[PDB]
Design a protein around this ligand. Structure first.
Ligand SMILES: C=CC1=C(C)[C@@H](Cc2[nH]c(/C=C3N=C(/C=C4\NC(=O)[C@H](C)[C@H]4CC)C(C)=C\3CCC(=O)O)c(CCC(=O)O)c2C)NC1=O
Ligand SMILES: C=CC1=C(C)[C@@H](Cc2[nH]c(/C=C3N=C(/C=C4\NC(=O)[C@H](C)[C@H]4CC)C(C)=C\3CCC(=O)O)c(CCC(=O)O)c2C)NC1=O
Ligand SMILES: C=CC1=C(C)[C@@H](Cc2[nH]c(/C=C3N=C(/C=C4\NC(=O)[C@H](C)[C@H]4CC)C(C)=C\3CCC(=O)O)c(CCC(=O)O)c2C)NC1=O
Ligand SMILES: C=CC1=C(C)[C@@H](Cc2[nH]c(/C=C3N=C(/C=C4\NC(=O)[C@H](C)[C@H]4CC)C(C)=C\3CCC(=O)O)c(CCC(=O)O)c2C)NC1=O
Ligand SMILES: C=CC1=C(C)[C@@H](Cc2[nH]c(/C=C3N=C(/C=C4\NC(=O)[C@H](C)[C@H]4CC)C(C)=C\3CCC(=O)O)c(CCC(=O)O)c2C)NC1=O
Ligand SMILES: C=CC1=C(C)[C@@H](Cc2[nH]c(/C=C3N=C(/C=C4\NC(=O)[C@H](C)[C@H]4CC)C(C)=C\3CCC(=O)O)c(CCC(=O)O)c2C)NC1=O
Ligand SMILES: C=CC1=C(C)[C@@H](Cc2[nH]c(/C=C3N=C(/C=C4\NC(=O)[C@H](C)[C@H]4CC)C(C)=C\3CCC(=O)O)c(CCC(=O)O)c2C)NC1=O
Ligand SMILES: C=CC1=C(C)[C@@H](Cc2[nH]c(/C=C3N=C(/C=C4\NC(=O)[C@H](C)[C@H]4CC)C(C)=C\3CCC(=O)O)c(CCC(=O)O)c2C)NC1=O
Ligand SMILES: C=CC1=C(C)[C@@H](Cc2[nH]c(/C=C3N=C(/C=C4\NC(=O)[C@H](C)[C@H]4CC)C(C)=C\3CCC(=O)O)c(CCC(=O)O)c2C)NC1=O
Ligand SMILES: C=CC1=C(C)[C@@H](Cc2[nH]c(/C=C3N=C(/C=C4\NC(=O)[C@H](C)[C@H]4CC)C(C)=C\3CCC(=O)O)c(CCC(=O)O)c2C)NC1=O
Ligand SMILES: C=CC1=C(C)[C@@H](Cc2[nH]c(/C=C3N=C(/C=C4\NC(=O)[C@H](C)[C@H]4CC)C(C)=C\3CCC(=O)O)c(CCC(=O)O)c2C)NC1=O
Ligand SMILES: CCC1=C(C)[C@@H](CC2=N/C(=C\c3[nH]c(C[C@@H]4NC(=O)C(C)=C4CC)c(C)c3CCC(=O)O)C(CCC(=O)O)=C2C)NC1=O
Ligand SMILES: CCC1=C(C)[C@@H](CC2=N/C(=C\c3[nH]c(C[C@@H]4NC(=O)C(C)=C4CC)c(C)c3CCC(=O)O)C(CCC(=O)O)=C2C)NC1=O
Ligand SMILES: CCC1=C(C)[C@@H](CC2=N/C(=C\c3[nH]c(C[C@@H]4NC(=O)C(C)=C4CC)c(C)c3CCC(=O)O)C(CCC(=O)O)=C2C)NC1=O
Lengths: 65, 164, 177, 300, 177, 164, 177, 164
């Protein structure tokens, strides 16, 4: 169907359609929304975050970054 | 049939360990609250018929349209199904009242009620009218002790919160 | 998972010593106050679904933008999950009422919830409003001051325990922000 | 309602060290299908426990890490038939009955192509796994009112059998292999006997009902109700002379009153018999007398 | 899973009526006898591993054919599983001692145990012997007549409860045959 | 940290339901057996030093070869590790004695003991000699309430059955 | 899983030949009759829950031993599973109404059901009675002869198809015995 | 029964592929070290009785309290269980010495040893005293072919590291 990796990268669906079994809070902490950042252009924004993670997907801290 | 002792035995079984002092304290509390539960069960076995009679009469008292067409208890037979079902309710409140957990009341009466009630067009609110009638009506010192009355009220409250 | 008993134990382990008379003394006050605590738990349990109904309906009433189309309370399924979550929040608050120590709620349900509701776009101030409604509702049931409820129990002082339950609700509403 | 509520498996979200211990223990039930794992075999799949108790690696992957270990492998992959490997690996992890020949044949075409590890990755990384239970619970006895094949419930309940029972069939294993003595057989192996399902799988019919009954959790209304009923006395005064025993061949005839009197007598001299421990404790006081000699030797 | 409470309940459901005075009366005798029951559970728990060790070693002693090469007790792993099964049998017997109703053991462990033994070639008479040793051992601990153990508890009558525990062990040893 | 209230909270959480009357009866039994537990904890906090002293002295009394070469506590430092470890044991018996379950004693002292003991060549039977000896030493009545002596003996019995 | 199309295919494969004019001709009669078939499916779908309610309530009415205490319809949970199973049986009968070949029902639901209901103590004659009530109910809806239902569709002959649906119900009720 | 050929057959089976040249090289090494293993097995079958005799006599030589009372076997029967168990140990060292892997020694003797030893109060360190006595004693050349000696020592070292 869909390769496991891409599923780790992809968004957590909704409960009423995408999954019957209600997810817990740690699984939003572990995968969630995963998007990497462009390389930033000033001294002020450079040191605070990794541009992107590879073979890893964080979730909902990436929203705040 | 969740009770004190079934929970602790199932839990110590889930650990796979022998029952430590904790479970022993739990069943110690079971034989503490036992006397109040059983006194309530004795008086419930005393006058259950008038309990069901007042409950059903109050139920048709609040809602007259149960005897309207053809939507509900429009025969003497279906009103016999009414006092029949409330007899089962007081029978389960007696059973769970003896056990001291909601377990037999849960597994026999509660589980899957809402599918039957939505399917055979039975509104739950009329049952709530009956139980809240027997809820409002309970005596303060006059028949049973506060624990006996409290225990009864608690069990019936569980019924209401599980019904709707 | 901590009991208040176990909280005293872990304090004694960090202190690396035995129990001592003072911690035992405060724990004796806990045990003597325990029956009031159990009665409070019975009060909050015996009206729980009713509290959830009134609290969530009041949350929708104080701002109808949630039921306005596109909002989170706007749809039928999402409303079901709304009632479900209010029920579960009330459930762990009740567990904290038996325990007397917040650590069960702190590690079970309070952890990761803020970043979940951020991760789903659930408005946090509306949730904290619902937690506030269950706070004042639970204190009104805990002091028998409900306008449609009257328990018949001998009078006494329980205001410390009322402030305890309000501390749990303010912990939740503080931690979902 | 599907009968899941009658059964009881807890798995809490991980809050203390306790919850970690219960969850680990329930996993090694379910992965091994109640097989007995000793210390050394406990120390086989070690590394997934550390990565799970650290919480760095999720729960389905702890289950994968235990399934990939050498012990589970030598019991349920190695000394089983090819079918038997498939429905065992299928029972432990997905907890169902193989639905049809195609499903099992596709797993076996996957084994001939790739072998065991890519299989276990197929059972874990199957979707029906993930939506059935994913990182939340441990595998368990699946009840679901909607069944893809009514046969699913049926063959799954023949897979499970009794809650007390386990998979090994040494006697069954013993007869087919040329061994007069069953216990003479290696016990590390044993999960491989004929595949109980495959008759029903290939032919698609007539699943037995006796086997199905065992797996049913015990129903509080039905099977308990028939079991105990010995009530009342027809006479207020019936005196039977029954026989008690005060050895293999020495026999007493008493009535219930008189046997009660006899037993009370046995209690009267039972205090007398239990007196002897005071002699034991007094004799132990003598240890103190021996110690006094040591005290004298120290003072000399 | 039944309690003695729940056994009275299911009897009342098969009778289709309420509880009535007599069943309540016998249940009152259960509750008044309950502390002796808990004390008995504490006795059997506090010496459990020791009972299992002595019982299984006595089983090996009464016939060394089990440790003779080719037997089931003959090997190291199979001896580990032997001790394990004796421990678990004692565990469910203890659960029946708290419950006062055998239905937990009847549906949990007694069901299919015989079938498992038949499948494994485990000699059933030897198992029933081990259950008999745990029977007399458990009655000796339950009556404080152990030759290396002395609990300090007020005297009274518990012989009905001793016969109860012996009824559980004779149920197991009857049902493994 | 298995106790009454941790078991019932974990169990009602495992159901996902509100705490019914059963759990309330369980914690009612916890405050029943509380006073006997805490009295035992008070006296244990009283004279623990002489408890550890008699336990260790009896432990080397039964087995002299602990001070033999080079296999065991052949220095004053390692005998200080002896009374140190028995201080930890009485500290955990105090903790579990306060809690009323074996939980903190289990998770802090019991779990994984046998690997350390087999690895650092420590025979468990000497610990069993210590616990058993103190066990006999405690008074039936004079030193604690009848329930309390029992509670202490029960906890220490758990230690013995978990040790070997 | 077979269609009537696929049933013709498998007949041609067992015959090892091509399709031929006769099987195509009968399949043309199927296609020309197909819209009546779809209309019949819409009729049985549009009153399905109602059929299940009336059929199961009539089954309980024709013998009140089921609701008598100890019976299978006697309890709340078990009644829920009763309504569920009647719904699912009606569901696979509807699938056989679209398919025109019984093999989907034969391999999906009809297989192993008899030995399941034997394995659970469900009375088979009562189930076959419920299947009979859904049979006559489904034929009454399929011929618009319901006493509280009137569809507005052009008149035509469908008695072959009515006998087809009655053949499915008689297959189920025959195979649950 | 892990050996060279069981590992390679199980591994190439786990791939599901035909045995390539790698496995053939592995069993080639098995028939290389074969002669030294089998020579050690021949001499072990030679004088095993005096091996067990010196091992047990050294075991009670290091620890006298085995014959103290109930702590250790104090009967001639239990010392017959002593030389019995060391006969089984040398029997398993013979078996694994023939196989060339630790496998039969592992699955028959090693697996689950520590539960029986902790349960029936058997201290492992006395077994270690016996095996380290037979370990120290080997004279290498002049006792047997030097290489065989290494094989024997290796096997017995595995026993020690698996015991405690
Ligand atoms: C302005 C430019 C700019 C960058 C280019 C990054 C570079 C960068 N990356 C990290 C930090 C990191 N970067 C990575 C990335 C990696 N993960 C892997 O598997 C791969 C080897 C690699 C991606 C290809 C990881 C994993 C961390 C966290 C490392 C850790 O905490 O262990 C940090 C430390 C701060 C932090 O934790 O975010 C910095 C400065 N940050 C910046 O400000
Ligand atoms: C198993 C369930 C279970 C319960 C639910 C309780 C219910 C309960 N509460 C009390 C007893 C009590 N309960 C309270 C509680 C109150 N204090 C107030 O200010 C408020 C009105 C209220 C808390 C909301 C007080 C104060 C007492 C003592 C009353 C008195 O002695 O005057 C008693 C009598 C015994 C005792 O003194 O403890 C009982 C049975 N007990 C149980 O076993
Ligand atoms: C153990 C504690 C515990 C909780 C507290 C909840 C918290 C929680 N809520 C949701 C999920 C949800 N929660 C709500 C609730 C809301 N609807 C609104 O209009 C309001 C803003 C709000 C009620 C006040 C909704 C609507 C969803 C579904 C969101 C969506 O799918 O869009 C989810 C994701 C999984 C799911 O879909 O159920 C979680 C973890 N779950 C738990 O396990
Ligand atoms: C595959 C490789 C691999 C490793 C290398 C380990 C690494 C590792 N160690 C621990 C965990 C641990 N590791 C140690 C070890 C230490 N004790 C100390 O006094 C020293 C500082 C240190 C030894 C030198 C301790 C004490 C813990 C438990 C920590 C705790 O629970 O507080 C954990 C968490 C899971 C667990 O509790 O076991 C992990 C992943 N695990 C693996 O799977
Ligand atoms: C939480 C744990 C816990 C326990 C372990 C028990 C322990 C215990 N037992 C008794 C009390 C008792 N226990 C027994 C038991 C005995 N009968 C005999 O023949 C034997 C010697 C022995 C069973 C092996 C008897 C007979 C009494 C009543 C003694 C009397 O009144 O004379 C009492 C006093 C209160 C009462 O009368 O019930 C207590 C605290 N109670 C608890 O709360
Ligand atoms: C819930 C209840 C419950 C039980 C009652 C047991 C029953 C049981 N015992 C064994 C397994 C075993 N049981 C024994 C026991 C015996 N050794 C002998 O010398 C005697 C004949 C007998 C003790 C009296 C042995 C030796 C094994 C292992 C057999 C083998 O592998 O050869 C197994 C197979 C799984 C395993 O290896 O552990 C099972 C299901 N298990 C359960 O789950
Ligand atoms: C929280 C609970 C807790 C315990 C119970 C102890 C248990 C314990 N003891 C030791 C370690 C030790 N324990 C002892 C004790 C013994 N000396 C003997 O003669 C007797 C056999 C025995 C006392 C009865 C000795 C001698 C050591 C040091 C062993 C050595 O280094 O050789 C160690 C290793 C770390 C160290 O060296 O201290 C640990 C974990 N530690 C804990 O944290
Ligand atoms: C917290 C728990 C706790 C206990 C359980 C006790 C245990 C205990 N008992 C004694 C001490 C003692 N205990 C006893 C008791 C006995 N007399 C006999 O005839 C019987 C064998 C036995 C009662 C059954 C006696 C006689 C002493 C004094 C011994 C002596 O000085 O010779 C001591 C030494 C200190 C002292 O002299 O008091 C201690 C620690 N103390 C505690 O702090
Ligand atoms: C795919 C096809 C398919 C089916 C045909 C059903 C068949 C079926 N029914 C039940 C289960 C059940 N079925 C019924 C039904 C009955 N109630 C009675 O009064 C009558 C005798 C009968 C309706 C005519 C009941 C009551 C149960 C629950 C039985 C119980 O728990 O006691 C179960 C066990 C799982 C469960 O509890 O749901 C199964 C597999 N399920 C499937 O997946
Ligand atoms: C997508 C959904 C969908 C449907 C549900 C049907 C509905 C439908 N049925 C018919 C048409 C028809 N439907 C029927 C069926 C009936 N014969 C009787 O005896 C019964 C009353 C009834 C079956 C229960 C008949 C007989 C016709 C032809 C009517 C005529 O030509 O006189 C037509 C007109 C076109 C045609 O002739 O096929 C349509 C749209 N078509 C669709 O596309
Ligand atoms: C196939 C390999 C194999 C072994 C290696 C043995 C290992 C072994 N030994 C014992 C059992 C025993 N082993 C010993 C031996 C000891 N006596 C002591 O003084 C010393 C510490 C030690 C000898 C060096 C004793 C005394 C027992 C009986 C223990 C008891 O019953 O208390 C048992 C339990 C069954 C029994 O009682 O026989 C087993 C499995 N058995 C096997 O099947
Ligand atoms: C039209 C949309 C709408 C609602 C829905 C309600 C919801 C609501 N309930 C309140 C508060 C509230 N609600 C209850 C519970 C409730 N009362 C009872 O007597 C019983 C038996 C109850 C459950 C059935 C209590 C007890 C209070 C406290 C006030 C009081 O004393 O009644 C409050 C006040 C909040 C606050 O103080 O900040 C609100 C907004 N209001 C709305 O505008
Ligand atoms: C030589 C091979 C051999 C054995 C091994 C023993 C095994 C054994 N123990 C028994 C019975 C038995 N065993 C114990 C347990 C044991 N005793 C204690 O005081 C403590 C602390 C124990 C664990 C260490 C008790 C308590 C009894 C009950 C008899 C008694 O009062 O001592 C019985 C009697 C069985 C019966 O009554 O039917 C036997 C056969 N016998 C043998 O012939
Ligand atoms: C007193 C105990 C009792 C019952 C309960 C009924 C049950 C019942 N319904 C029938 C049959 C039946 N039932 C319905 C369904 C039903 N009718 C509708 O119009 C709607 C909307 C319905 C659901 C609310 C239909 C449509 C039929 C077919 C007959 C008809 O045309 O009405 C039949 C005939 C069975 C047969 O033909 O073999 C029976 C026995 N009969 C009893 O004696």
């Amino acid at each position: 169907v869909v390769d496991p990796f891409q599923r780790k990268f992809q968004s957590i669906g909704k409960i009423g359609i995408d999954y019957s079994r209600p997810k817990k809070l740690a699984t939003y902490k572990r995968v969630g929304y995963s998007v990497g950042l462009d390389f930033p252009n000033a001294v002020s924004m450079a040191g605070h975050y990794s541009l992107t993670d590879c073979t890893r997907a964080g979730g909902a801290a990436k929203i705040l970054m | 049939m969740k009770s004190v002792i079934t929970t602790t035995i199932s839990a110590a079984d889930a650990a796979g360990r022998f029952p430590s002092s904790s479970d022993l304290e739990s069943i110690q509390g079971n034989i503490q609250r036992a006397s109040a539960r059983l006194e309530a069960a004795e008086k419930l076995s005393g006058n259950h018929e008038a309990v069901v009679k007042e409950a059903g009469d109050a139920c048709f008292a609040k809602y007259s349209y149960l005897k309207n067409s053809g939507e509900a208890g429009d025969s003497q037979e279906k009103i016999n199904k009414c006092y029949r079902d409330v007899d089962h309710y007081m029978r389960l409140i007696n059973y769970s009242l003896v056990v001291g957990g909601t377990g037999p009341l849960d597994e026999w009466g509660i589980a899957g009620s809402r599918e039957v009630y939505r399917t055979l067009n039975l509104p739950g609110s009329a049952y709530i009218a009956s139980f809240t009638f027997t809820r409002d009506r309970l005596c303060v010192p006059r028949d049973m002790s506060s624990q006996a009355g409290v225990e009864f009220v608690a069990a019936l409250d569980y019924v209401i919160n599980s019904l709707s | 998972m901590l009991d208040a008993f176990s909280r005293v134990v872990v304090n004694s382990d960090s202190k690396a010593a035995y129990v001592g008379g003072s911690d035992l003394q405060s724990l004796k006050t806990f045990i003597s106050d325990g029956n009031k605590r159990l009665d409070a738990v019975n009060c909050i349990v015996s009206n729980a679904s009713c509290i959830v109904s009134d609290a969530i309906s009041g949350m929708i009433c104080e701002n109808p933008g949630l039921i306005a189309p596109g909002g989170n309370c706007y749809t039928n399924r999402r409303m079901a999950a709304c009632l479900r979550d209010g029920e579960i929040i009330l459930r762990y608050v009740s567990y904290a009422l038996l325990a007397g120590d917040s650590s069960v709620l702190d590690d079970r349900c309070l952890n990761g919830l803020k970043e979940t509701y951020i991760a789903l776009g659930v408005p946090t101030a509306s949730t904290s409003r619902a937690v506030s409604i269950m706070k004042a509702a639970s204190t009104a049931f805990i002091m028998n001051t409900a306008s449609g409820r009257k328990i018949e129990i001998a009078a006494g002082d329980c205001q410390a325990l009322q402030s305890e339950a309000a501390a749990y609700f303010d912990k939740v509403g503080s931690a979902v922000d | 309602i599907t009968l899941d509520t009658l059964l009881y498996h807890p798995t809490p979200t991980i809050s203390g060290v306790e919850d970690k211990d219960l969850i680990c223990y329930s996993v090694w039930k379910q992965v091994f299908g109640n097989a007995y794992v000793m210390e050394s075999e406990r120390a086989d799949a070690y590394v997934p426990e550390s990565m799970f108790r650290a919480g760095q690696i999720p729960l389905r992957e702890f289950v994968r890490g235990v399934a990939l270990s050498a012990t589970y492998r030598r019991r349920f992959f190695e000394c089983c038939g090819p079918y038997r490997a498939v429905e065992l690996n299928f029972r432990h992890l997905l907890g169902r009955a193989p639905v049809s020949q195609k499903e099992v044949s596709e797993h076996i075409k996957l084994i001939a192509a790739k072998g065991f590890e890519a299989e276990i990755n197929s059972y874990i990384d199957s979707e029906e796994y993930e939506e059935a239970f994913g990182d939340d619970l441990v595998p368990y006895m699946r009840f679901k009112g909607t069944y893809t094949t009514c046969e699913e419930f049926n063959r799954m309940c023949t897979m499970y059998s009794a809650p007390g029972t386990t998979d090994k069939s040494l006697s069954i294993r013993a007869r087919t292999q040329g061994i007069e003595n069953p216990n003479h057989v290696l016990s590390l192996d044993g999960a491989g006997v004929p595949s109980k399902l495959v008759s029903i799988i290939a032919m698609g019919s007539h699943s037995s009902f006796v086997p199905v009954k065992r797996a049913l959790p015990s129903r509080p209304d039905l099977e308990f109700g028939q079991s105990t009923k010995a009530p009342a006395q027809v006479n207020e005064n019936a005196n039977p002379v029954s026989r008690v025993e005060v050895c293999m061949g020495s026999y007493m005839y008493l009535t219930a009153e008189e046997a009660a009197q006899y037993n009370t007598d046995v209690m009267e001299q039972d205090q007398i018999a239990s007196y002897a421990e005071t002699e034991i404790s007094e004799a132990e006081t003598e240890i103190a007398r021996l110690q006094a000699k040591i005290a004298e030797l120290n003072l000399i």
